Amino acid sequence: GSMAKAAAIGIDLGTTYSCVGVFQHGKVEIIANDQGNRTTPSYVAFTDTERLIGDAAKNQVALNPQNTVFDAKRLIGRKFGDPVVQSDMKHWPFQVINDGDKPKVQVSYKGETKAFYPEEISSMVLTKMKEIAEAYLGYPVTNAVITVPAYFNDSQRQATKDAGVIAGLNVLRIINEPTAAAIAYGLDRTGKGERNVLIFDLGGGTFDVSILTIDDGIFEVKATAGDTHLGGEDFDNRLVNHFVEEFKRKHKKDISQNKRAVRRLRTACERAKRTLSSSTQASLEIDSLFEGIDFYTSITRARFEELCSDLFRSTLEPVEKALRDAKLDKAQIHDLVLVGGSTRIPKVQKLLQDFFNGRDLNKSINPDEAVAYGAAVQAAILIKSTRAAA
Ligand SMILES: Nc1ncnc2c1nc(Br)n2[C@@H]1O[C@H](CO)[C@@H](O)[C@H]1O
Numbered sequence: 423g424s425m426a427k428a429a430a431i432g433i434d435l436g437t438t439y440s441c442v443g444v445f446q447h448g449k450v451e452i453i454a455n456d457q458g459n460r461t462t463p464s465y466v467a468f469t470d471t472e473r474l475i476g477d478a479a480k481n482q483v484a485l486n487p488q489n490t491v492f493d494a495k496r497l498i499g500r501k502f503g504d505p506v507v508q509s510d511m512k513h514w515p516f517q518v519i520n521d522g523d524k525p526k527v528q529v530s531y532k533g534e535t536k537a538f539y540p541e542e543i544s545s546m547v548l549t550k551m552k553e554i555a556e557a558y559l560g561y562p563v564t565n566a567v568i569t570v571p572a573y574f575n576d577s578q579r580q581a582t583k584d585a586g587v588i589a590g591l592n593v594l595r596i597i598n599e600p601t602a603a604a605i606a607y608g609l610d611r612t613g614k615g616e617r618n619v620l621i622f623d624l625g626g627g628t629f630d631v632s633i634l635t636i637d638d639g640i641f642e643v644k645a646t647a648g649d650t651h652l653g654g655e656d657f658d659n660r661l662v663n664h665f666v667e668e669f670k671r672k673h674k675k676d677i678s679q680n681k682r683a684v685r686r687l688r689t690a691c692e693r694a695k696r697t698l699s700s701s702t703q704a705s706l707e708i709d710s711l712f713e714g715i716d717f718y719t720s721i722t723r724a725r726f727e728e729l730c731s732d733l734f735r736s737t738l739e740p741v742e743k744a745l746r747d748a749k750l751d752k753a754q755i756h757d758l759v760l761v762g763g764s765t766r767i768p769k770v771q772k773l774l775q776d777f778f779n780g781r782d783l784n785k786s787i788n789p790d791e792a793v794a795y796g797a798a799v800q801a802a803i804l805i806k807s808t809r810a811a812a
């Protein structure tokens with residue numbers, strides 16, 4: 423009579439990392455890729471012989487900086503003249519060119535100079551998320567919900583849909599990232615009455631706070647605030663500067679001019695930063711860091727917390743501005759939701775919990791996965807085609 427329908431997927435198309443989920447058997451499954459990672463870098467690399475996407479792209483970035491593209495989400499649906507674009511270009515090693523006041527990334531690929539629109543790069547990341555899902559389900563996937571930040575305008579939302587269409591996906595809906603995080607916790611299923619939800623999203627390079635109102639499953643964005651210059655990378659920079667100084671004191675050598683040694687130091691710092699979220703101390707062990715000198719040292723959580731103290735406290739400024747803009751008091755917030763891997767930092771949790779006078783934080787769904795989780799829940803609801811009984 424009627425063949426079984428393929429499951430629909432939920433994709434969190436992130437600036438630095440993307441995540442894919444599927445709702446099946448009354449639960450969401452966040453799907454790991456072929457290297458066993460539950461999140462995949464939003465990176466695309468170009469060589470003379472291949473196009474690499476995800477972990478394979480990010481793992482070769484050090485020797486191929488001009489032809490490895492990342493951060494396409496910062497360019498999508500924007501004009502080349504936009505001041506945001508002009509400032510970001512100074513930080514990127516790849517070339518961004520002007521094509522009719524629209525940015526394009528220009529790279530060397532298969533023996534030719536090729537330029538791509540930001541939606542084409544994003545479609546390559548979406549093609550990888552679709553393949554990760556089809557590897558798990560064992561059949562082709564057609565339908566998806568893709569998420570965007572709440573501040574995205576119509577042009578930015580249409581370019582995201584265009585990326586999905588290029589990737590061979592039927593885009594069921596473009597939904598806001600804070601709304602997807604709320605749906606992941608079933609905050610739209612609590613029945614009659616109004617609820618105020620604050621979403622605290624601390625990413626790799628940016629911080630976003632959103633205040634939503636939920637009434638009979640209807641969502642309304644009340645306020646948005648944030649800091650474009652606050653994220654996980656700034657906490658990594660503080661550790662890097664700390665260990666460069668430590669090497670200088672101990673061995674009387676300045677390493678800051680050997681790119682390999684700085685990169686090896688930064689890679690080790692980022693991992694030490696992650697260990698410190700679960701442990702009270704972490705070891706740093708690098709062999710032949712500079713001039714055949716082995717760098718074996720440690721960092722306590724208390725010292726790391728001191729190094730980043732001003733940065734962690736500054737997350738409360740957008741919280742207070744969002745509360746003023748929404749015309750709400752902190753006692754009027756019913757639910758606090760954590761989004762992004764940097765929210766695992768115990769001190770960040772402590773500062774926010776203390777700000778909301780001891781209230782519990784919803785952090786049971788991995789913060790790097792909550793957006794895709796909610797998008798997968800929505801995707802399964804959107805493909806239902808039930809006919810009413812008599
Ligand atoms: N457990 C964790 N504790 C502290 N930080 C973390 C953790 N896991 C992740 Br993931 N991060 C950071 O989140 C950002 C995601 O773009 C990156 O800067 C990661 O370093």
Ligand SMILES: [Mg+2]
Nearest residue numbers: 436437625793
């Ligand atoms: Mg995100």
